[PDB]
Design a protein around this ligand. Structure first.
Ligand SMILES: O=P(O)(O)O[C@H]1[C@H](OP(=O)(O)O)[C@@H](OP(=O)(O)O)[C@H](OP(=O)(O)O)[C@@H](OP(=O)(O)O)[C@H]1OP(=O)(O)O
Lengths: 317, 362, 14, 186
């Protein structure tokens, strides 16, 4: 895959295996807290004992191979020596610990980019981000194809990078590493339909030896024109409602006709008729046949305590 | 049974099992509304109540209205809480309290005064009867009259602009006598939101987030922290934590240590302590009266926390011992007269002596 | 007469 | 009327107002008649309840005179000085701080162990008015380990709605202390 793959991907792969190795070892209890002569040492694993485990599991054939792999790991810094700072693997029962157990944990731009990419790939693998699908661009169908436009949208929507500009710049770094490459020409990340193919795959890790708001009530969609026409079953009525100690108890939520939304059954409005399925056109004299519900709300409140209201009062039709 | 024990999280899953397998009468659904209201998740409560607001009996939706209104108030949707309010029975304590707070939001001060007066006499019956048994029995009603008097100070807050510096000082020590209960603090703090935003008082909300994590739900304590920061640090890990509001970001790192992300907290803490000395210096302006002491006061806590975690993560080591003494010694000089700074440092030296004696005798 | 009238600053005893 | 009218045309009113205030103070400390002192206190309250800006710097000569009246070694005089202090506690926020400590003792004696069934509505109303403006809220539950008990007893014994609606407001403004701290305070 060229220099870009051969360097960065190889670094990525050893870390993926080291994490795979650590998880297995923790399950196998190789790394466990130890106390030497009443002095503690947490998350420690003796170097000499580990070689035996590898041979049983077939990761390392013999002492030579195990030492070489561990030496390669040390040259990276994924592990360190708790007892001494030589940090060179030896076939002696000496406690060691991974940089990932927070003994040192140095983090490089490559590591941070790789780890975020791994976490994003788990999201892509997960149903949460299902954009990965077989799709065809430039006449060829490739697996794990997700439109670059869709990806940029998904990043903002998901919130991994809320700002699109920030997201776009980050993708270029991943493209440089080779984590994501456009399916055909590896065209740099743009807000375009360009489908991409994830060169990096999370699974099949390397082997050691290889290293809502509204509701609405009235059925009628619009009654404004029918109300305006004289001939309709509706007979107009005027209701004068007196205020109460705690309020009138009615709500009007009609956009154009300002129909009554709800009425408190124990409130004064319900006592003086004022059924839910009604329409109003004038309040305290002023005609409000064509205004917004909000505008209506402000006017009624500022008026007197007693309100003169005209109700359309459809006759069961 | 779970509700009577005030144990809501397992109550909700129990109701879920009786409903996810099969929909039933509108009594199991109403049971969850009493559970989501106590839990404090208004996002899920609103979608359930709004969808079911139509295909239910008129009497049934009268019970639901009180819980539905609280969710809308907590979500800020003021255009719909008006709807839910007008079916709460008006001859109840909650029927006047929930429409008194509705007058404040839409700026009706004369109407709200009667509603507060009307709500006081309704609570009188429920208070005199409960007070005849014991003071402990009559506490759930006394916390209700506590919030009735806090609405009269909201009117005074919006009227005279010269008092908005001691009103949010009385609200502080008046909150130091109430029982440390998440449900009690969730209601009082929601009342003091029509006037003062969380960004105007960290001193009160930080103590709320600490209480939520310490004795209740860690999830609630985490959404109230990203609200204060303005960004969610959990989404992006490589970027450093926000630097502004040093007190707020200090509490966030403590939360991470309690949770699984122990590794992240230790590294973020190192970066934060380092960035403070540079910010402490290069400051021509002098604020030694309050700011300089406050900056120095925070340094001691950060250094103390750092030492303990390094001892927890790496143990007592021949290498570790010299490191934590540098952290502890620097903490003592930043904030003297602190008990936990001197005692801890003295203990570490004593522990070092013991370890060396064991080593050279073997 | 009205619901939206601001009350007086110094209320006397009633 | 003039106090409201003095806020816009101070060129003529202030001299007359100062003279009137001096006369009232003289009557309080010179004339030893219970009828005259009651009259002066009520007139003073209207001036402060209507022109708060002018009276605010004059807390010291007015408050000290009223306190000495309450410690004289007559129902009419007490009911008017207590009400007047109610308006003096609203004009001066966080300024009446050195007088609250010496003022509960006077007020609390008229509520607890009240030998005479006098008007406790004035004392109850003014008690909740000088703690909502001073800001002295949770501390008084300690030094006086009886105030919480007597307030609860007022609910059952009293039948007037005005008194009942005021014993609840005072219970809310002071605090909602947890039942354990009540046990610690006995
Ligand atoms: O729970 P902890 O991790 O031990 O933290 C405590 C706790 O602070 P929080 O308010 O953040 O929970 C104390 O508060 P209390 O709830 O016990 O009242 C606080 O004491 P103060 O309220 O007196 O400030 C104390 O602070 P300090 O160390 O200055 O004594 C602080 O300890 P840490 O900051 O060391 O964690």
């Amino acid at each position: 895959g060229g220099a870009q793959q051969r360097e960065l991907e190889r670094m990525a792969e050893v870390l993926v295996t080291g994490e795979q190795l650590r998880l297995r070892l923790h399950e196998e209890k190789v790394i466990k807290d130890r106390r030497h002569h009443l002095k503690t040492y947490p998350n420690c694993f003796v170097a000499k004992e580990l070689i035996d485990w590898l041979i049983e599991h077939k990761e390392a054939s013999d002492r030579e191979t195990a030492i070489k792999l561990m030496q390669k790991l040390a040259d990276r810094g994924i592990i360190h020596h708790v007892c001494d700072e030589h940090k060179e693997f030896k076939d002696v029962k000496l406690f060691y610990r991974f940089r990932k157990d927070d003994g040192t944990f140095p983090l490089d731009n490559e590591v941070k980019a790789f780890m975020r990419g791994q976490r994003l790939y788990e999201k892509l693998m997960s149903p949460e981000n299902t954009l990965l699908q077989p799709r065809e661009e430039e006449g060829v169908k490739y697996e794990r194809t997700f439109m670059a436009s869709e990806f940029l949208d998904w990043l903002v929507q998901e919130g991994e990078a809320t700002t699109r500009k920030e997201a776009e710049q980050l993708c270029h770094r991943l493209m440089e590493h080779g984590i994501i490459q456009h399916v055909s020409s590896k065209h740099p990340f743009v807000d375009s339909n360009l489908l991409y193919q994830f060169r990096m795959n999370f699974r099949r890790r390397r082997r050691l030896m290889e290293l809502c708001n509204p509701k609405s009530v009235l059925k009628r969609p619009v009654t404004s024109e029918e109300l305006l026409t004289p001939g309709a079953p509706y007979a107009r009525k005027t209701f004068t409602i007196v205020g109460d100690a705690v309020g009138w108890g009615f709500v009007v939520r009609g956009s154009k006709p300002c129909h009554i939304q709800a009425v408190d059954p124990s409130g004064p409005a319900a006592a003086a008729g004022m059924k839910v399925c009604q329409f109003v056109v004038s309040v305290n004299g002023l005609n409000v046949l064509h205004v917004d519900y909000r505008t209506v709300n402000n006017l009624i409140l500022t008026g007197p305590r007693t309100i003169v209201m005209e109700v359309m009062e459809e006759l069961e039709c | 049974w779970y509700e009577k024990l005030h144990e809501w999280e397992d109550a909700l899953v129990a109701y879920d099992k009786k409903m996810d397998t099969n929909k039933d009468d509108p009594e199991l659904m109403l049971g969850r509304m009493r559970c989501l209201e106590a839990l404090g998740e208004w996002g899920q409560l609103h979608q359930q109540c709004c969808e079911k607001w139509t295909l239910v009996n008129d009497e049934t939706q009268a019970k639901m209205a009180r819980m539905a209104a609280a969710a809308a108030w907590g979500l800020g949707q003021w255009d719909s809480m008006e709807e839910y309010t007008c079916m709460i029975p008006r001859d109840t304590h909650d029927g006047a309290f929930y429409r008194a707070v509705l007058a404040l939001h839409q700026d009706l001060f004369s109407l709200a005064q009667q509603c507060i007066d009307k709500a006081r006499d309704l609570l009188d019956a429920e208070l005199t009867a409960m007070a005849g048994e014991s003071y402990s029995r009559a506490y759930g009603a006394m916390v209700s009259c506590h919030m009735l008097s806090e609405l009269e100070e909201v009117i005074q807050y919006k009227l005279v602009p010269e008092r908005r510096e001691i009103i949010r000082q009385i609200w502080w020590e008046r909150l130091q006598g109430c029982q440390r209960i998440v449900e009690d603090w969730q209601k009082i703090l929601m009342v003091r939101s029509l006037v003062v935003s969380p960004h105007e008082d960290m001193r009160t909300w930080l103590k709320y987030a600490s209480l939520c994590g310490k004795s209740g739900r860690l999830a609630l304590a985490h959404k109230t922290l990203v609200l204060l920061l303005g960004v969610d640090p959990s989404r992006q890990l490589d970027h450093p934590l926000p630097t502004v509001h040093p007190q707020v970001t200090y509490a966030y790192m403590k939360n991470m240590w309690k949770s699984a992300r122990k590794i992240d907290a230790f590294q973020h803490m190192q970066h934060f302590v380092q960035t403070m000395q540079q910010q402490a210096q290069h400051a021509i302006a002098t604020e030694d009266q309050q700011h300089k002491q406050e900056l120095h006061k925070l340094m001691a806590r950060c250094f103390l926390k750092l030492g303990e975690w390094q001892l927890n993560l790496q143990g007592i080591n021949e290498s570790t011992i010299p490191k934590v003494l540098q952290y502890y010694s620097a903490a003592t000089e930043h904030d003297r007269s602190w008990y936990k700074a001197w005692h801890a440092w003295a203990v570490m030296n004593f522990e070092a002596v013991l370890h060396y004696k064991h080593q050279n005798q073997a | 007469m009205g619901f939206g009238t601001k009350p007086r600053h110094i209320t006397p005893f009633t | 009327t003039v106090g409201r009218l003095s806020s816009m045309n101070p060129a003529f009113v202030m001299p007359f107002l100062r003279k009137m205030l001096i006369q009232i103070l003289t009557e309080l400390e010179h004339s030893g008649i219970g009828r005259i002192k009651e009259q002066s206190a009520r007139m003073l309250g209207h001036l402060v309840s209507n022109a708060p800006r002018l009276i605010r710097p004059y807390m010291e000569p007015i408050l000290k005179a009223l306190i000495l009246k309450l410690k004289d070694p007559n129902p009419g005089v007490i009911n008017n000085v207590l009400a007047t202090i109610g308006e003096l506690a609203q004009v001066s926020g966080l300024e009446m701080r050195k007088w609250v400590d010496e003022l509960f003792i006077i007020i609390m004696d008229m509520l607890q162990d009240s030998s005479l069934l006098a008007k406790r509505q004035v004392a109850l109303w003014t008690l909740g008015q000088l703690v909502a403006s001073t800001g002295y809220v949770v501390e008084p539950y300690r030094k006086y380990p009886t105030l919480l008990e007597v307030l609860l007893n007022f609910l059952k014994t009293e039948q007037n709605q005005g008194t009942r609606r005021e014993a609840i407001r005072v219970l809310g403004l002071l605090g909602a202390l947890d039942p354990y701290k009540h046990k610690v305070n006995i």
